[PDB]
Every structure is written in structure tokens, then in C-alpha cells.
Amino acid sequence: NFMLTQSHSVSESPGKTVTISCTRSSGSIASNYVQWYQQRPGSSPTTVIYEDNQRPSGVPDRFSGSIDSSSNSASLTISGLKTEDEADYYCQSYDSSNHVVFGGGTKLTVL
Amino acid sequence: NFMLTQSHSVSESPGKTVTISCTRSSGSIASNYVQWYQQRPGSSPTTVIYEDNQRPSGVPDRFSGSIDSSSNSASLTISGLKTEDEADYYCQSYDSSNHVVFGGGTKLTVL
Numbered sequence A, B: 001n002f003m004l005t006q007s008h009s010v011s012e013s014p015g016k017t018v019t020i021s022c023t024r025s026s027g028s029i030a031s032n033y034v035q036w037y038q039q040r041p042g043s044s045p046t047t048v049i050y051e052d053n054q055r056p057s058g059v060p061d062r063f064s065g066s067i068d069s070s071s072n073s074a075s076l077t078i079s080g081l082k083t084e085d086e087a088d089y090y091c092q093s094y095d096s097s098n099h100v101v102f103g104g105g106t107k108l109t110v111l
């Protein structure tokens, strides 16, 4: 139905803030919930954001999700970058038949 | 919700058949659809099985999914193993709030 195009891999110093973006290619980004997963090297994906901006229990408030209707994108912002945040991040949403669509992933390196 | 516990990583020769399993920790495996994703080295997850046993277009019939209610498990079988099948494989399902639950992943190494 569409693809989710994520922003380029980024490097950032500890304590800083980084924002990763996820652009839906057709149809409104606001038409289906966006989730964000963190996948640390060698590990499995875990939710950091679901329903656009909800944090699961145990995910700290340094993580926040947003939706920008004008750019048809979703964004994940991580402030207070810790070296434990070094991971590949994936945005994910659903098409009309409720099939999962994954973004292509963004690598975050903590300098 | 529940956890999905995957079978151990496996190495197998080309042309052989491999089965990876995924056991749901509580509740009924059959109560929510199970999806399997292939994650090739350095790439994003792509669906190989959805809705327990459905292949997306372009996924070869070497891949098949099944559910075993008596062991509360799902299985992904890959016949005629190919070098291109070398990947981490993740099972995935949903809880009654529709929250996504991922398995911890199983690495398939093709010898």
C-alpha cells in the first residue's frame, strides 16, 4: 500500500538530542498508528513508542514520538542520549488490510 | 501480555529443511495471528509469513507457517534451504490490546 522511508543513519554525542524521521509514501501518516522499535546490536526489536506517542512501561521519558501531518512523517526523538540508546530504530505502521509495513531502519551511533 | 520464546539458532546445509519454533508464554497461541519476519544481515525485517501461514507475494513456497495449539507454539519451516535464506528470523504476534509482541529471534546460518 505504501512504504515508510526513514531518515539517514546518525551519530551524536552522549547527553545530546537526536530526531529520526519516517515518511509515509502514500496515504496519510495519520491514518494508521505508528510504532517505533529499538533493536540493539545482536538483539531483537522492542517497542519504544506505540500508537504514535505512547511509551511502554519501562521506556524512559527521554523517548518521544510525534506525527507531522504537513510532511506526512512520524518522528522519534531521544534526548539525553545514552550509549545504551545505540541501536537500529524502525518505524512501523499498518496498511488498509492491516498488514504490517516496516520502515527500512535508521542506525543511531552514540559518539 | 506474554512472551514469545524462539528455538535456538541453527546452522544447516543448502537444500536441507529447517524448522524454527516460537512458543507463547501464556494465553492461547491460536488467539492472535502469528507473523514471521526475515531480517537479512544489515537489513530491515520483511514479512515471510503473516496470519499464521500466509505468504506475501514474492515469498517462495519453500517458506511455510503452522500453529501447534497443543504445545502453544508457532513454526516456520523453510525447505530447500538457500544461501539467501541466511537471516535472523522473528516471530511476532499481538496481545488483546493489539500491542505487538516480538520473539527474541533465531539466527539461521546456511553452511
Ligand code: NA
Pocket: A052, A053, A054, A055, A063, A064, A065, A066
Ligand atoms: Na511520546
